[PDB]
C-alpha cells in the first residue's frame, strides 16, 4: 500500500484511463492518503556504472519515449549521474543533461579545493543500483542506509524532475519555510508546497521562504541532513514506508549528504557548506518594538518614553512604512518630520533604530524622485525579455494625488489607490551601487542634512518578491513558463499558476557574471538576491556590523541576515509554533529568528501576551510587533500588573546577554547551532525525539514555556542531568522525568544544565547601560559532570571583530570545589579597558559546608565573606568591592 508512488500528482486529468497512458495502474481506495494512479515499472535505465577513488558516475536512458512521453515536460535524454566524495563527512550527487546546460542555483557554497576523502575515514559508502535505476547511500559506521532511491517514479522533464528515497526511519525534521504543526514531521500522506509567496504561516501553505533541507534520525541516536540546491517551484511528500518524494519544475537534481553523527555536528557541516549565520551586533540581542500604523513622528516617542517610565528594557525602536511618505522608499512622511531628530535623541541615550525597506519602487510620481529615476537611469529594474517596458507590480505605494478611503474594499484600494511599482534585480551589479546609494543618503541626506535618519539596521522585507496583483498589471502576462507549468506543484492558489500574489514568470534577470535568467528559475532566490547587498549598504554608511532581518530566505540566505517568522496571528497554537519556526530555521542556518511577540494579526489579549512576552523574551530576535488597525500590544499599554511582570522576564533576558551573545559568536564561527531542540544534545533519550513544546538557548539553557490559556502550572520533560532553576539555583531533581512544575502567570520556568558555567551581567535599560555595570558567574555544577564554561568580549558593534583583532575569548572550567579561567586571546579588555566583574555564584556545591578553599586568585589571593545554605547548594561570593576584571582573574 506504501511503496505505491502517486503517478497523477497533477492539478487536472487524473483519472483511470489517462493514468493508464503513463506507465500507471489505477486502484482506488477507502484508506486516506493513497495514490490511485500508481507506478507499476521505470522509465530510465542506469547503464554503465563506474566507481573510483573519489567518486562514482553511471548514465541514465530511457527505456522507452512511449510513456516519459506521456506526462508534464518533455523529457530529458539521455541524463548523466556524478557522485562525489567532497570530505569524510559529505558528498554530492547531482543529476543533469550533459548535452544542454540546464539551468542551475547561483548561490556560491564552498567545497574542497579537490575531493578530500580517505579510505580509512569515509564515513559513508554508495552505490548506484541498476534496477529499477536507484542510489544507495550507506553509514559504513553501522550498515543504516541513509539514502535509497531505488523506488519507482523518477522522471526527469524539462519542468518537471521527480525522485524520491526511503528514510532510515520515522523522524525527519524541517522543510522550505512553513508552519508546520510539530517538529517532526508526519509521513502519513502529506504533500508541501514550496515557493517564496506573501502568505501568513498556515498548515500546508507555502510561505516567504524555501529551504530544500532535512534532517533525518536513524534507527540509533545518529543523524544526517540532506539538501536539495534546487531554487525552482517544487513540492516534497511524505508517505508512511518511511519515504518522500520530491518534485521540482525544472533545475538539476543536485544534492549534498552530510552524515556527522550528531545533530550539531550535522549542522555544522551543513552550515560549512552554504555559509555559518552572521554575527550579529551586541545590541541586536535586546528586546524590540515596532507596530504598523506608528501615526505620528511623536507616537513613537510618547511610547518610548513610557518605556523608559516603566523601566522595562529595551535596545531596538522600530517604525513601519508609516515613517514614508505613502509608503515610498526613502522619503520621510510629513507627519514625521522631526522623526529625525528622535532617532538622534534616542540613540544618544544607548538605543538604536532599525527601518523597513521594501524591495519595489514607484514609478507613477510627479515630484523629482531620485530613488525611482537614477532607478531606470542605472537600470536596475527587471523588464520583459524582448526589451518590454519595466515589469509592473502593485505593493503599498500610493498614487500621488489620490485621496484614500482607509476603509475601502482591500481589492478597490489596490486599483484606486496603489502606485505602479518597479522590481529592482539584485543580481546586477548595477543595481548594488543603486541600492547602497539610496541607502546611503537615507542616512546621509544630500539636501536636507537636518532630515537624515540614522538607522543603526535594515529590516528588509515584502522581498518574496510579493505583489498585490497577480503576474504583472494591466493587460497581465502572456505566458505558459508562468500559469499550468505542466506541473503546477501543491503550492497555494495552485488554480492561479506561478503568477500569484508576485511577478510575472518569464520577467527577465541577469545574473552577476551577465547572463540572462528568467523568474522561473530564480524567484525563490529573490529576496536572498538582496541580502548582502542590504547587508554591505548598512555596514558601508554606518561603519558599524549593523544587522539585516528579512523576510524570504534561502539556503545561506541567513549567512548575512536574521529571520522574523512573519505575518501570525494573535491565537495561542502561534506561540508553539514559533518554538519550531526558530528550531527549523537554526537547522537551515539562521539563528537570529524569532516570531512577534503577542501576534501581529488581529487584536492581542491580556493573558495571552503575557505568556508571549516571557516565551518571546528567549527568542534570538525579540520583538514585540503588530498589524495596522489592531489595538496596541506593547508591554507598556496593559496595566501596572503586566509592566512589572514584562520588567522582571526582560531583566533575566539582559542578564543572559553575554551567554546568548557567545551562542551567536560559536555559531558564527563553529556552525553550531543557538536555539537547539533538546534532541540535540540528549540524543540517546528517545523521548526528547518528540518535545517541541520546549527548547534550548546553547547546550545549557532550557526553556520551559507555558503555551495554554487557563494554565498556571505546566508539565515539561527534564533529561538524564542537573537542572537548576536560574532563579533560585536549587536542583529540580528530575532526571529522564516528566515533572509538573508551577507556573504562575508572573513566572516564567528556566533551568541551567550541570556541567556548564554562565556568564552573566546586571539588566540595565538598554545594552550601553547594561555593558557598564558587573559582569557575573554562574557555576552550574553538576554531580552529574562538574563545570565547563565560555565567554567572549567584543566592541559589539565592530566589523569582523573576531576575524582580525580586537576580542576576548575565555574558557571556563570548574574541577575540584574549584572555578579556574583560562584566556585563550585577549585584545579588547586591557588595564585601562576593564570588564567590572561582580558576582559569583555556584550551585550544586555539597551539603557539606566545608571548603578547602575559599579564597580567589588575581596574582594577589583574597578571602571575601561569603553567604552559604547547605539545605540549597548555592554558593554566593559578592566582589562589588575589589578591582577584579576578566583580564586579570583566575
Ligand atoms: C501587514 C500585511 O499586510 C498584507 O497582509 C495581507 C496578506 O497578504 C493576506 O494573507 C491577507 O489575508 C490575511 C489576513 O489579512 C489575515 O487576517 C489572516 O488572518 O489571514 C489572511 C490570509 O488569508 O490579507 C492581509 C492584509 O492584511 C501583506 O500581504 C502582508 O505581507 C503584510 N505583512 C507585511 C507588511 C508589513 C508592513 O510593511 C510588515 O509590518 C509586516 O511585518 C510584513 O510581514
Redesign the pocket.
Known amino acids: 500500500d506504501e511503496e505505491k508512488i502517486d503517478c497523477y500528482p497533477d492539478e487536472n486529468g487524473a483519472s483511470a484511463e489517462n493514468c493508464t497512458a503513463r506507465g500507471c495502474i489505477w486502484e482506488a481506495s477507502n484508506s486516506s492518503g493513497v495514490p490511485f494512479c500508481y507506478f507499476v515499472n521505470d522509465l530510465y535505465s542506469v547503464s554503465d556504472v563506474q566507481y573510483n577513488s573519489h567518486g562514482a558516475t553511471a548514465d541514465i536512458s530511457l527505456k522507452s519515449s512511449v510513456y516519459a512521453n506521456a506526462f508534464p515536460s518533455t523529457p530529458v535524454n539521455p541524463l548523466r549521474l556524478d557522485v562525489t566524495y567532497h570530505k569524510n563527512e559529505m558528498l554530492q550527487f547531482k543529476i543533469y543533461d550533459p548535452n544542454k546546460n540546464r539551468y542551475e542555483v547561483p548561490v556560491p557554497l564552498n567545497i574542497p579545493s579537490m575531493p578530500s576523502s580517505t579510505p580509512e575515514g569515509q564515513l559513508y559508502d554508495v552505490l548506484i543500483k541498476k534496477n529499477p535505476f536507484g542510489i544507495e547511500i550507506r553509514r559504513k559506521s553501522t550498515g543504516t542506509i541513509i539514502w535509497d532511491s531505488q523506488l519507482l517514479g523518477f522522471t526527469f522533464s524539462d519542468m518537471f524532475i521527480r525522485i524520491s528515497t526511503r528514510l532510515p526511519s520515522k523522524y525527519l525534521y524541517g522543510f522550505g519555510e512553513t508552519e508546520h504543526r510539530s517538529y517532526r514531521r508526519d509521513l502519513e500522506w502529506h504533500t508541501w508546497g514550496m515557493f517564496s509567496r506573501?502568505?501568513?504561516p498556515?498548515y500546508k501553505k507555502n510561505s516567504?521562504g524555501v529551504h530544500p533541507y532535512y534532517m533525518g534520525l536513524e534507527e540509533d541516536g545518529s543523524a544526517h541532513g540532506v539538501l536539495l540546491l534546487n531554487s525552482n517551484a517544487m513540492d516534497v511528500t511524505f508517505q508512511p514506508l518511511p519515504a518522500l518524494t520530491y518534485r521540482t519544475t525544472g533545475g538539476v537534481l543536485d544534492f549534498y549528504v552530510f552524515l556527522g553523527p550528531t545533530p550539531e555536528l550535522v549542522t555544522q557541516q551543513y552550515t560549512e557548506l552554504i555559509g555559518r549565520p552572521v554575527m550579529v551586533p551586541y545590541w541586536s540581542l535586546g528586546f524590540q518594538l515596532?507596530?504598523?500604523g506608528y501615526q505620528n513622528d511623536s507616537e513613537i516617542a510618547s511610547l518610548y518614553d513610557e518605556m523608559v517610565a516603566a523601566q522595562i528594557p529595551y535596545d531596538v525602536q522600530y517604525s513601519?512604512?508609516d515613517y514614508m511618505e505613502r509608503?515610498l522608499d526613502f522619503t520621510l512622511s510629513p507627519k514625521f518630520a522631526g522623526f529625525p531628530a528622535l532617532i538622534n535623541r534616542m540613540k544618544a541615550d544607548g538605543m538604536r533604530v532599525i527601518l523597513?525597506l521594501?524591495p519595489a519602487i514607484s514609478g507613477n510620481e510627479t515630484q523629482p524622485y531620485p530613488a525611482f529615476t537614477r532607478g531606470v537611469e542605472d537600470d536596475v529594474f527587471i523588464k520583459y525579455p524582448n526589451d518590454g517596458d519595466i515589469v509592473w507590480g502593485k505593493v503599498?505605494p500610493d498614487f500621488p494625488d489620490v485621496v484614500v478611503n482607509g476603509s475601502l474594499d482591500?481589492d478597490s484600494q489596490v486599483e484606486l489607490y496603489r502606485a505602479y511599482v518597479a522590481f529592482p534585480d539584485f543580481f546586477r551589479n548595477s543595481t548594488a551601487k543603486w541600492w547602497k546609494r539610496e541607502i546611503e543618503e537615507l542616512y546621509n541626506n544630500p539636501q536636507n542634512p537636518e532630515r537624515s535618519l540614522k538607522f543603526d539596521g535594515m529590516?528588509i522585507?515584502?522581498n518574496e518578491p510579493?505583489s498585490?496583483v497577480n503576474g504583472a498589471v494591466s493587460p497581465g502576462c502572456r505566458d505558459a513558463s508562468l500559469n499550468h507549468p505542466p506541473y503546477m506543484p501543491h503550492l497555494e492558489s495552485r488554480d492561479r499558476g506561478l503568477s500569484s500574489?508576485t511577478l510575472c514568470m518569464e520577467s527577465q534577470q541577469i545574473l552577476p557574471d551577465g547572463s540572462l535568467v528568467q523568474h522561473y528559475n530564480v524567484h525563490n532566490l529573490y529576496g536572498w538576491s538582496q541580502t548582502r547587498p542590504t547587508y554591505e549598504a548598512v555596514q558601508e554608511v554606518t561603519g558599524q556590523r549593523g544587522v539585516v532581518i528579512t523576510?524570504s530566505t534561502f539556503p545561506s540566505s541567513g549567512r548575512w541576515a536574521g529571520h522574523?517568522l512573519?505575518?501570525n496571528?494573535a491565537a495561542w497554537d502561534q506561540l508553539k509554533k514559533s518554538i519550531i519556526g526558530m528550531m527549523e530555521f537554526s537547522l537551515f542556518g539562521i539563528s537570529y529568528t524569532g516570531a512577534?511577540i503577542c501576534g501581529?494579526?488581529?487584536d492581542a489579549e491580556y493573558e495571552m501576551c503575557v505568556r508571549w512576552m516571557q516565551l518571546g523574551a528567549f527568542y534570538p530576535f525579540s520583538r514585540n510587533?503588530?498589524?495596522?488597525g489592531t489595538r496596541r500590544q506593547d508591554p507598556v499599554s496593559w496595566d501596572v500588573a503586566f509592566v512589572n511582570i514584562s520588567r522582571t522576564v526582560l531583566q533575566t533576558r539582559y542578564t543572559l546577554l553575554p551567554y546568548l551573545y557567545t551562542l551567536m559568536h560559536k555559531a558564527h564561527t563553529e556552525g553550531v547551532t543557538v536555539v537547539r531542540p533538546l534532541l540535540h544534545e540528549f540524543v540517546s533519550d528517545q523521548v526528547t525525539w518528540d518535545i517541541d513544546s520546549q527548547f534550548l538557548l546553547g547546550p545549557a539553557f532550557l526553556v520551559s514555556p507555558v503555551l495554554e490559556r487557563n494554565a498556571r502550572n505546566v508539565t515539561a520533560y527534564f533529561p538524564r542531568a542537573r537542572w537548576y532553576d536560574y532563579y533560585t539555583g536549587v536542583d529540580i531533581n528530575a532526571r529522564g522525568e516528566w515533572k509538573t512544575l508551577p507556573a504562575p502567570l508572573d513566572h516564567i520556568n528556566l533551568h541551567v544544565r550541570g556541567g556548564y558555567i554562565l556568564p552573566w551581567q546586571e539588566p540595565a535599560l538598554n545594552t550601553h547601560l547594561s555593558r557598564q555595570k558587573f559582569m557575573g558567574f554562574k557555576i552550574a555544577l553538576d554531580d552529574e559532570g562538574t563545570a565547563g564554561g565560555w565567554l567572549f568580549w567584543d566592541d559589539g558593534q565592530s566589523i569582523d571583530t573576531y576575524g582580525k583583532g580586537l576580542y576576548y575569548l575565555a574558557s571556563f572550567s570548574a574541577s575540584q570545589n574549584t572555578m579556574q579561567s583560562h584566556i585563550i586571546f585577549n585584545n579588547y579588555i586591557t588595564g585601562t579597558n576593564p570588564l567590572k566583574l561582580g558576582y559569583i555564584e555556584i550551585w550544586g556545591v555539597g551539603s557539606v559546608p566545608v571548603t578547602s578553599v575559599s579564597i580567589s586568585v588575581s596574582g594577589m589571593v583574597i578571602t571575601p565573606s561569603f553567604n552559604n545554605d547547605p539545605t540549597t547548594q548555592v554558593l554566593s561570593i559578592d566582589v562589588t568591592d575589589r578591582n577584579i576584571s576578566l583580564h586579570n582573574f583566575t
Do not use: E, L, V
Open positions: 506573501d502568505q501568513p498556515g516567504y515596532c507596530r504598523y513601519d512604512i509608503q523597513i521594501d503599498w482591500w529590516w522585507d515584502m510579493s498585490f500574489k523576510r522574523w512573519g505575518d496571528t512577534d501581529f494579526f488581529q510587533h503588530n498589524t495596522i
